[PDB]
Amino acid sequence: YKLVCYYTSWSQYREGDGSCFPDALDRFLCTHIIYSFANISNDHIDTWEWNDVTLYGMLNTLKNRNPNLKTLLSVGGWNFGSQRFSKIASNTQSRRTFIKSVPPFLRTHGFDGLDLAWLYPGRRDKQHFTTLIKEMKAEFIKEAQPGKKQLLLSAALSAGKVTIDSSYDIAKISQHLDFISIMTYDFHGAWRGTTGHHSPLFRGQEDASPDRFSNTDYAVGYMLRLGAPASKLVMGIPTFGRSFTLASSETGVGAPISGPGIPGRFTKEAGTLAYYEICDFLRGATVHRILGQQVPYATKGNQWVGYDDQESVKSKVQYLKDRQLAGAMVWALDLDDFQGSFLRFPLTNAIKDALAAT
Numbered sequence: 441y442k443l444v445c446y447y448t449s450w451s452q453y454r455e456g457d458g459s460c461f462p463d464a465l466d467r468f469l470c471t472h473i474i475y476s477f478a479n480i481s482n483d484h485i486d487t488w489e490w491n492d493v494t495l496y497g498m499l500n501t502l503k504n505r506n507p508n509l510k511t512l513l514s515v516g517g518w519n520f521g522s523q524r525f526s527k528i529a530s531n532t533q534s535r536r537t538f539i540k541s542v543p544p545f546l547r548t549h550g551f552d553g554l555d556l557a558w559l560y561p562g563r564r565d566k567q568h569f570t571t572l573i574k575e576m577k578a579e580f581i582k583e584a585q586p587g588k589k590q591l592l593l594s595a596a597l598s599a600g601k602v603t604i605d606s607s608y609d610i611a612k613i614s615q616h617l618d619f620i621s622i623m624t625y626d627f628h629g630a631w632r633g634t635t636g637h638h639s640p641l642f643r644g645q646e647d648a649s650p651d652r653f654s655n656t657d658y659a660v661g662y663m664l665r666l667g668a669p670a671s672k673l674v675m676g677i678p679t680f681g682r683s684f685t686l687a688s689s690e691t692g693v694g695a696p697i698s699g700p701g702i703p704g705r706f707t708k709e710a711g712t713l714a715y716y717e718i719c720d721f722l723r724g725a726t727v728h729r730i731l732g733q734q735v736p737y738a739t740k741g742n743q744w745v746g747y748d749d750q751e752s753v754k755s756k757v758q759y760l761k762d763r764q765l766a767g768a769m770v771w772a773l774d775l776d777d778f779q780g781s782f783l784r785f786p787l788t789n790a791i792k793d794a795l796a797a798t
């Protein structure tokens with residue numbers, strides 16, 4: 441089984457024990473660690489943070505004692521230009537420039553592959569996205585024909601049915617990618633103005649859910665139905681939770697809200713909490729496991745957060761193995777309890793143990 445784990449460079453700037461650098465990562469925890477994110481500048485792949493070369497080194501050092509560990513560099517994100525990615529994929533000139541720039545950059549900085557995290561191609565760039573993936577794979581094939589270990593090509597794909605329908609040609613890009621990480625979190629499941637778990641495993645109670653596609657099971661089944669081999673499918677599991685400010689004494693799935701939850705001390709973003717922030721939050725809170733959805737939420741005062749814990753990620757790993765998928769993907773290592781402030785990496789270690797069947 442694959443255990444694909446993301447590291448985010450901006451996590452270095454977090455205060456106190458939130459500060460996360462690649463040397464805090466257990467070199468044996470994951471089979472693949474993906475560094476997020478790299479830039480596209482002048483139609484070339486390039487660094488993003490000022491100390492990216494150094495952090496690259498800290499990350500790829502981890503393979504010294506661990507030769508099986510593979511690393512990829514992720515390009516894209518949600519604070520990208522996105523028009524830039526479309527320009528590179530649509531403009532043939534920019535496309536050849538980017539594709540040619542990638543293998544030497546990766547070899548120079550010690551990465552074993554590239555990860556595409558374009559969010560999102562859209563209706564206009566579905567075909568350009570397919571072309572980009574095909575020609576990227578072709579250049580990787582050419583670069584290593586003289587008996588070199590071939591560069592890997594992966595892609596993080598949305599788990600949202602609408603985005604999947606408008607953005608991806610699944611059966612075509614699946615034959616070129618080494619694996620597909622399906623982002624089975626950030627689901628916009630709940631009715632508007634209402635609490636909902638952002639990463640439920642199953643639909644759960646039928647009349648308590650606005651639609652059928654806003655759950656992990658549906659997204660995995662759909663991507664399989666569209667022609668993605670199970671052996672190339674890596675199911676994403678979040679080490680973060682989605683939070684809401686309650687508007688009433690109702691604390692269940694479906695309760696009214698006035699907006700996003702209060703930002704955590706370390707990540708400082710309304711509506712989201714890192715898992716260690718959630719561990720701090722759990723002191724004094726009540727945890728209810730959503731019966732049909734197999735994931736927990738925790739409530740305290742006017743605060744509601746749907747998250748994943750050790751039991752729920754064990755359940756999700758059992759799901760992916762029953763489906764015979766390639767493994768699990770984790771977003772993100774720096775959002776797990778990496779310093780063990782509440783052992784270390786509790787959620788990712790739970791995923792890793794659960795991946796070891798029986």
Ligand SMILES: *[C@@H]1O[C@H](CO)[C@@H](O[C@@H]2O[C@H](CO)[C@@H](O)[C@H](O)[C@H]2NC(C)=O)[C@H](O)[C@H]1NC(C)=O
Nearest residue numbers: 478479480481482483486487488489490521524
């Ligand atoms: C990522 O790449 C983009 C594209 O080259 C950079 O955008 C330019 O940044 C310079 C410096 O601030 C500006 O003067 C230009 O006007 C920008 N051009 C465009 C088209 O956006 C961006 O700075 C890069 N980011 C990082 C962190 O390296």
Ligand SMILES: COCCN(CCc1ccc(Br)cc1)C1CCN(c2nccs2)CC1
Nearest residue numbers: 518557596623626680707709712713714771
């Ligand atoms: C409002 O946030 C929406 C963006 N979501 C969540 C970001 C977030 C997490 C924790 C905190 Br605390 C604050 C923000 C990301 C999640 C993972 N991501 C990818 N996974 C694989 C490749 S790209 C897609 C977008």
Ligand SMILES: [Br-]
Nearest residue numbers: 601651652653
């Ligand atoms: Br419909």
Ligand SMILES: [Br-]
Nearest residue numbers: 601652653662
């Ligand atoms: Br359907």
